[PDB]
Amino acid sequence: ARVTVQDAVEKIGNRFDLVLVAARRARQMQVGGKDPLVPEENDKTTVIALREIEEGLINNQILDVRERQEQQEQEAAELQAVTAIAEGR
Amino acid sequence: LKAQTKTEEFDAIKIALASPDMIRSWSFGEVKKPETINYRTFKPERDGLFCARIFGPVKDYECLCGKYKRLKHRGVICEKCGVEVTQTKVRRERMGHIELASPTAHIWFLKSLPSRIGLLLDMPLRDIERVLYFESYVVIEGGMTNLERQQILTEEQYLDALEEFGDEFDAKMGAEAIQALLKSMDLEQECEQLREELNETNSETKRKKLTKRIKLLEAFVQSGNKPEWMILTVLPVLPPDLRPLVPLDGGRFATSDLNDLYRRVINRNNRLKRLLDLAAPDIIVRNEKRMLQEAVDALLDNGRRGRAITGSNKRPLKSLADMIKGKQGRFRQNLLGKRVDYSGRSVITVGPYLRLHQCGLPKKMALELFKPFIYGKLELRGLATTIKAAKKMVEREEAVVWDILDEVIREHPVLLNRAPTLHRLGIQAFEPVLIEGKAIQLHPLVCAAYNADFDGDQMAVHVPLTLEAQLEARALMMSTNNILSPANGEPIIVPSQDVVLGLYYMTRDCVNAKGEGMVLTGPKEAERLYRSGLASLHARVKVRITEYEKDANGELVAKTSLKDTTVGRAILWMIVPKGLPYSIVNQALGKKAISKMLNTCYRILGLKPTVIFADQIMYTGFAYAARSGASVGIDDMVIPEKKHEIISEAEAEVAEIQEQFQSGLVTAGERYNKVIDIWAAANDRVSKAMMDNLQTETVINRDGQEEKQVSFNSIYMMADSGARGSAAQIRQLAGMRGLMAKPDGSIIETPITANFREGLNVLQYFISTHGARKGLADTALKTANSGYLTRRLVDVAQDLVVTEDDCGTHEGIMMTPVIEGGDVKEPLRDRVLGRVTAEDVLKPGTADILVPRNTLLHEQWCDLLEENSVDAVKVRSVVSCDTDFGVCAHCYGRDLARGHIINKGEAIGVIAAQSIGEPGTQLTMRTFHDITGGLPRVADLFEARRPKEPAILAEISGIVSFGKETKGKRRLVITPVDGSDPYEEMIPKWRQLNVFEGERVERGDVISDGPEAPHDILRLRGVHAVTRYIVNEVQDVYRLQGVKINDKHIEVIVRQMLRKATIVNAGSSDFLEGEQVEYSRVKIANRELEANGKVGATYSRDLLGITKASLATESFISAASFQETTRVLTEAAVAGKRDELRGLKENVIVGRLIPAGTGYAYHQDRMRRRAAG
Amino acid sequence: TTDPVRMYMREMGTVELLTREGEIDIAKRIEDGINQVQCSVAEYPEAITYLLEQYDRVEAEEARLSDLITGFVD
Amino acid sequence: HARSTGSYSLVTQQPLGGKAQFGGQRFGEMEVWALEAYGAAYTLQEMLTVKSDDVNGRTKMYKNIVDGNHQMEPGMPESFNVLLKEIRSLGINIELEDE
Amino acid sequence: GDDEDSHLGDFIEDTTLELPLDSATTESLRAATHDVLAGLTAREAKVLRMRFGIDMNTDYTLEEVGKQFDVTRERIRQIEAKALRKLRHPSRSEVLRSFLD
Amino acid sequence: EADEAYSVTEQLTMTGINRIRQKINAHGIPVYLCEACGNPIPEARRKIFPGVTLCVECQAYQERQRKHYA
Amino acid sequence: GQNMRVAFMPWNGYNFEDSILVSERVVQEDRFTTIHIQELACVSRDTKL
Ligand SMILES: [Mg+2]
Ligand SMILES: [Zn+2]
Ligand SMILES: [Zn+2]
Ligand SMILES: [Zn+2]
């Protein structure tokens, strides 16, 4: 999806929401939070995200869903720890 | 939950008056001395305009005296000198104050055009100014005596008035008096007074002036301000570093002009404090006061006095007001515009080897531009120990870095921008390709959009820094994403000149040449035949081709045929992608036919295939252009064999009309216009003579006898193809070059009989001079004129954004072909393409739904329409859209560089203006042609200017007649059958009337002739009528000039023209006020089923000219950008106006996300968080 | 009019210049005026004893001779 | 000419030619309408915030750039910060409301 | 010149400012010093961090440092020199060296 | 660039001349009585100008009068 | 200036608008090579320090 973006513009209609959704994805990867869901051709995270929009593995729904999942993945680890803030009682 | 305190990301902004106690809240010490710095140890003197105790340390985190120099000590106020040690930033943030002895009038609320201090007391200005310089005493709360509360007395009068009533009546003079009036004055009390007088005395002379005050008062009450505050007790001082005293080289100093001003104010104030303890005579303490009132005014806004000059320097010194104001408004937001990091420029050159999505960027430039990126990637991969090493590495230009730069360059767009940024295509995003050389290489197809030639023009580069900016520049600004003009859905990336001359020569045929008549298996072997010199490029040939047509249900059908073509056209088909027909390349391919080809490719295969196709077109056209060896020599410009004949004939025609003039058969002015025709004719004979000779006279033979065909002469191929030059310009090379005219316009009676292939002689050139010089002169000014028109249009649009998806209104405008007298000056298909239907369209027969309600009319629909005899269609337009505060996606249309419907958030107001304002360069600013037609004719339209001698229209239906007589104006009386008759308007009977005097006339008929004012058409004929008047009469000028601007744009401007309305009933609004139909439309809905019917209210749409419409803006920050700044703030500060941002202009000012495009998401998501919990 | 230079000139133009004698007419009232308070000050009991305590401060080295008097009548 | 990061004007913390490594290109009004016609909301902010006027933002950015994090922590342009003070030093109380 | 709204003050550059390339390296000089002092012995870190103002207010006289360890005097004066000596040659020397211009 | 300046000139020149040209019309045919004042129209004016309605006297006069007010 | 052998024809687009296409023989012949003289000055001043 380097030359034209048209194929991603179909998967999200706005053409604007694309830029924002693809960015929120690109930062998950550039700031090495995650690893790509599609073969990285030494393309930077700009296009690597855009490739994922075309192939249909990343959209606003998924990211909000994937985000909301980690919120509870990390909540579980701290569970036995943040509970030890019974010092307030 | 807890609110907040410290620096949040603010929204909304408030402006107001400053309480004297309020100014003290900001101050961190009173500046008490006119001292600056020491004269030896250039330290700041405590405590004066520059000071550490009050404002801040002279060097970072270091006490002034030097006791505490350790960076650990911060919150320390040194026991020596009261100097807290923090950043020097606070010498740019911290304010201070001066306490004034006597009150002093704030020159803005006293002298901004409508004096605020004036009409708040209902007191004249020349009287107030009289009180201030102690010319006369003025009463204050005159009590039960002899004197009005605001009456003014003279010295000799006040004394005599005093002898009678000692106390129980008081008068003062000077600033203290005004301050007393405002303090004592009760608005609430005076508000009740003004309410009775309105209803009691019924007068249009009286209650028109009365009402204008009462609303102005209760504004100031509900504001929050206190009238006393317009008289200054406390005066703030501007942080030192914003008016600095920095050193220069050679040891000489430089300083701001505010310093001379602020100094003089401090001195005169101090010298007055002294005079009060010396008990000086009134004649002096007055004079001192007068000087302070002057020095304050020269500080605030110098120029509303006598213009205080700077020390020893003739120039006047720049005041606070002069520091905000400018040309136009705030300098900072005006172009330019702020310099910007990560940028550069140089000369641009070509590079046909580019793909359309890239550009040639000098090695040297890319190194300096991406410097932080290289420092990063270098230490990321471990090639540098630390950033300081990376600095030295790229400084050393070690060869290792080049390989790094190519990494950081790859998927990282840059922005290219060329000189006058006219439409959004003036900035475009490319992928950078490293270049040895110091010039930028610019893909040739984009040259059209930039209006770039290569006579040495330079372009700028910009690096998208943030991740957002890369994806913004890649999905919106990239070259390949914007190939369609936003003005007219047609491709703007059409092949320019060299490249089209290429294809033309290629897909062209001659009568007999190598390869004549053979047959070949397919395109592949047609090239094989040519490259080896066996076949001629242009020879008539049957070849097997396989074309495709996706005519199935979205499915590709293949067709193979032995098509009758030429070798050239065969080879070319190897480019054309899939679903196009072989018919499209079977022709001759001129510039005209070559762009329609690109168009159909877009509307059938989509963006992606068109882009890569368009590249191949350029690459191939260039290649074969070189092979062709087309050139131009002297012998190419073939003169007609008959030229000298044609001259002597029209030369004898003047000799006929001459004989007749001398013999008085014809008159003198007659003879001039006679000769000018017989010359003007001969030029048309010489022109279409050579053009018959030049066009076809290559006469060549095929096996049999003789034959003739379109010429292959070099200079012809250029014009016929459309690569450059037209039979018009050619007419000056071979045939004679017209008659010229001096700047006057009065065309000279002895034409240029010579042409350019011949010499011109002395006189002929000298005559050619005038037209040439005025030509350059004109287009020099035509540069300024384009710029101003587009600027006004965005000021009145701008803030308009697509907001809703579908407002759900069934209303719209009726689209028909334009049919301007002759035949079909513009087709119906064009007017309706990309627009959405108001209501379902029926066949000529009915029960038959062709297009069902609102469907986006793309290319198929437009033909299924044109298949039947469909004659007119109603379409939703921006002028009709029920959505308030914006435009719903449906009512707009589709247009973009992309072919789908306009997206939510796209900022269509701006893009409308640009599209209209860009071609303004191609329109004439003269006048052309009783009727007019040119670029100022456009502005006159957008400005709603009523014309010189208007026509007048039937104000109501019914039978008319004349009454009374010739009193400068003869009364015309319309009388309807049912309704009231009362309309009698007095018409000047010395303009020719057209009304039949005893006939019934439909309201909105022509009662005289001549142009009519758009203000009428809206009022008498309807919102949809006036909107149709503008769009057709403006498009007439553009369409006369060959400029395509889809009505869509002109319509959005029209919307902003009738943003406002005036009321006619009552209940909850002001009966007569003018306001946006938006606020009404929402609020008659908020009364039709809400509170009371109240009543009401009915309104009336009002046509505002663009310049006047833009002048009214909700955001006061926006207004201070382009309006007069002094007035805007003053008018706004008394009102306590709150700006919520919301618009575009202001958010750019304050440097946050534009409330459109990508930001629309954020602003929308944040605006709802407001007015909530 | 406006600009202060004019309206000062006019404000002081009313007051008429003194005669050779009229200079002393006002000069005399000045002496009379000051003298009246000089006699009003001399009459005050606390004003007397104060100058005693303040002089007793100068001989005990708690002031200086310059701090209190500027010479006498002689 | 080309400039990554260079000199900044004292009065306005704005890219300025000082050592002939010349000031960056000026991005005037018309070039802003260009970005406004696209959706280029961030490209515009960065253009007249961290790339120029934001005394705090520019360094926060450059540090982020070399850390390999493409972001912006913008805040407020000093050009507007001076207007607030310039207005506030007239008799006008100009505040930033709310939250 | 030009009469244009180019004014003298518009060219007066700021000299008190700290250009990022330097603000960059300073944020990175802390990094190198910190890692160099942890890759030392914990006593040589407390000793060196103390002789210089390194993440502490003021810096301390070498005697002040001795009493704080109970083994005092000439003792501390040698630990310093060896710690510097340690950070002097390579593996260690490489990184800090590059900060010099 | 600059080319357009030339282009501009040509369009202007053409328009001015054209207006002038039209002010002569074409194949006309009619009578001989002057519409203003009835004076004899000679066939010379009829054959030089097809459709002439103003005698040589009036074809000056009016022209002359317009000049005066300029 | 210096005159040279010039031939009018499209050369694969390397003269698209008014751009010019030049043979190496010219830069090798140092013939449109141009000699420039800049004046750079150093000043010893007196500052407060
Ligand atoms: Mg040019
Ligand atoms: Zn101190
Ligand atoms: Zn709508
Ligand atoms: Zn006559």
Swiss-Prot record, chain B:
InterPro entries according to UniProt: DNA-dir_RpoC_beta_prime, DNA-dir_RpoC_beta_prime_bact, RNA_pol_asu, RNA_pol_N, RNA_pol_Rpb1_1, RNA_pol_Rpb1_3, RNA_pol_Rpb1_3_sf, RNA_pol_Rpb1_4
Record protein name field: DNA-directed RNA polymerase subunit beta'
Effect of residue 756 to C: Resistant to antibiotics salinamide A and B
Consequence when changing residue 731 to C/H/P/S: Resistant to antibiotics salinamide A and B
One of the record's GO molecular function terms: DNA-directed RNA polymerase activity
Practical and industrial applications: Co-administration of salinamide and rifampicin or salinamide and myxopyronin suppresses the emergence of resistance to both antibiotics.
Family: Belongs to the RNA polymerase beta' chain family.
Residues binding Zn(2+) 1: 63, 65, 78, 81
SUPFAM superfamilies linked to this entry: beta and beta-prime subunits of DNA dependent RNA-polymerase
Taxonomic superkingdom: Bacteria
Gene transcribed to yield this protein: rpoC
Alphabetic keyword roster: Acetylation, Antibiotic resistance, DNA-directed RNA polymerase, Magnesium, Metal-binding, Nucleotidyltransferase, Transcription, Transferase, Zinc
Example GO BP: submerged biofilm formation
PTM summary: Acetylated on several lysine residues in the presence of glucose.
SMART domains: RPOLA_N (SM00663)
UniProtKB/Swiss-Prot annotation, chain D:
Posttranslational mods: Acetylated on several lysine residues in the presence of glucose.
Biotechnology note: Co-administration of salinamide and rifampicin or salinamide and myxopyronin suppresses the emergence of resistance to both antibiotics.
Family from the record: Belongs to the RNA polymerase beta chain family.
Subunit and partners: The RNAP catalytic core consists of 2 alpha, 1 beta, 1 beta' and 1 omega subunit. When a sigma factor is associated with the core the holoenzyme is formed, which can initiate transcription. The rRNA transcription and antitermination complex (rrnTAC) consists of RNAP, NusA, NusB, NusE (rpsJ), NusG, SubB, ribosomal protein S4, DNA and precursor rRNA; S4 is more flexible than other subunits. In pull-down experiments interacts with CedA. (Microbial infection) Interacts (via flap domain) with Escherichia phage lambda antitermination protein Q; this interaction renders bacterial RNAP resistant to transcription pausing and allows it to read through termination signals.
Described function: DNA-dependent RNA polymerase (RNAP) catalyzes the transcription of DNA into RNA using the four ribonucleoside triphosphates as substrates. Resistance to the antibiotics salinamide A, salinamide B, rifampicin, streptolydigin, CBR703, myxopyronin, and lipiarmycin can result from mutations in this protein.
Residue numbers of the full-length protein present here: 1244 to 1342 of 1342
Swiss-Prot record, chain E:
Free-text comment on this protein's domains from its UniProt entry: Contains 4 domains, connected by flexible linkers. In the active conformation, the domains are in an extended conformation, each making extensive interactions with the RNA polymerase catalytic core. In the autoinhibited state, sigma-70 factor domain-1 packs closely together with sigma-70 factor domains-2 and -4, contrary to the extended conformation that is seen when the protein is part of the RNA polymerase holoenzyme.
Residue ranges of the annotated DNA-binding region, renumbered to this chain: 62-81
Family designation: Belongs to the sigma-70 factor family. RpoD/SigA subfamily.
Subcellular location: Cytoplasm
This protein's name: RNA polymerase sigma factor RpoD
Region annotated Interaction with anti-sigma factors, chain positions: 73-88
Residues with site note (Interaction with anti-sigma factors): 51
Species for this entry: Escherichia coli (strain K12)
Assembly and interaction partners: Interacts transiently with the RNA polymerase catalytic core formed by RpoA, RpoB, RpoC and RpoZ (2 alpha, 1 beta, 1 beta' and 1 omega subunit) to form the RNA polymerase holoenzyme that can initiate transcription. Identified in a complex containing RpoD, the RNA polymerase subunits RpoA, RpoB and RpoZ, CRP and DNA. Interacts with Rsd; this prevents interaction with the RNA polymerase catalytic core and with promoter DNA, and as a consequence, promotes transcription from promoters that require alternative sigma factors.
Sigma-70 factor domain-4 as annotated region, ranges: 36-89
Curated annotation (Swiss-Prot), chain F:
UniProt cross-references to PROSITE patterns, sorted A to Z: ZF_DKSA_1, ZF_DKSA_2
Zinc finger (dksA C4-type): 34-58
Keywords: Metal-binding, Plasmid, Zinc, Zinc-finger
KW Transcription (keyword) present: no
Gene3D superfamilies named among the record's database cross-references: DksA, coiled-coil domain (1.20.120.910)
Chain segments annotated as coiled-coil in the UniProt record: none
Keyword Nucleus: no
Ranges that cross the membrane: none
MF terms (GO), sorted A to Z: zinc ion binding
Any Pfam family the entry gives: zf-dskA_traR
Record-given protein name: Protein TraR
